[PDB]
């Protein structure tokens, strides 16, 4: 059955961009997916999106501008102390200068730079670069 909606969303988006598409539909939607797309947008990797209601689990329409080298999730959501972040940075990311590991903390969803800017830990949910 369906377990990880975010994993399927990110696979669909990577496929659509690798083809060279302008838009892609991902279903279902969820609060976590909207948070992940909001972070991707604020870093500049995707354009506008739109969540369309259907009195069910909704759909999302995503606009693409060809800046996404890769995006994925980490399952299960291992927890990370503040000092192990860097031992993860040199594991998933192509460098120490660009790319983003996304954590959920008691201060919200955020990338790793802000996580060591607030010197806290959390649980890893995914990455894009």
């Amino acid at each position: 059955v369906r377990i990880n909606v975010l994993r399927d969303a990110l696979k669909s988006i990577c496929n659509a961009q690798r083809i060279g598409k302008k838009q892609v539909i991902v279903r279902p939607s969820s609060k976590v997916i909207i948070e992940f797309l909001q972070l991707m947008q604020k870093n500049g990797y995707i354009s506008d999106f739109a969540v369309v209601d259907n009195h069910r689990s909704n759909r999302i329409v995503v606009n693409l501008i060809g800046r996404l080298n890769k995006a994925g999730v980490i399952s299960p959501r291992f927890d990370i102390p503040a000092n192990d972040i860097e031992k993860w940075v040199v594991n998933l990311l192509p460098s120490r200068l660009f790319g983003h590991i996304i954590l959920t903390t008691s201060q919200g969803i955020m990338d790793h730079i802000e996580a060591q800017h607030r010197q806290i830990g959390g649980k890893v949910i995914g990455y894009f670069y």
């Binding site: 060279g20 501008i65 060809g66 800046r67």
Partner: protein
Amino acid sequence: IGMKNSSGVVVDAYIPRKCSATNRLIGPKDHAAVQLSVARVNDKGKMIENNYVTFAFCGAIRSRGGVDSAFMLLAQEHGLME
């Protein structure tokens, strides 16, 4: 722009071209890449010398035949077609 020194100087040897369709970098030894240019008449049905538009396409967009529609869509955005 490209990669910078710590002071502000670009330490990059050259900047590859980007695809007009899929924004992907061209790269050297991609010999299926093509750059080509369009007249942009503007003058009572006759062209104007040395005033063109120019696009580029990487080999990935050509290998599947996506260029015939993407080039048309790009042209309809620059006032060269409709």
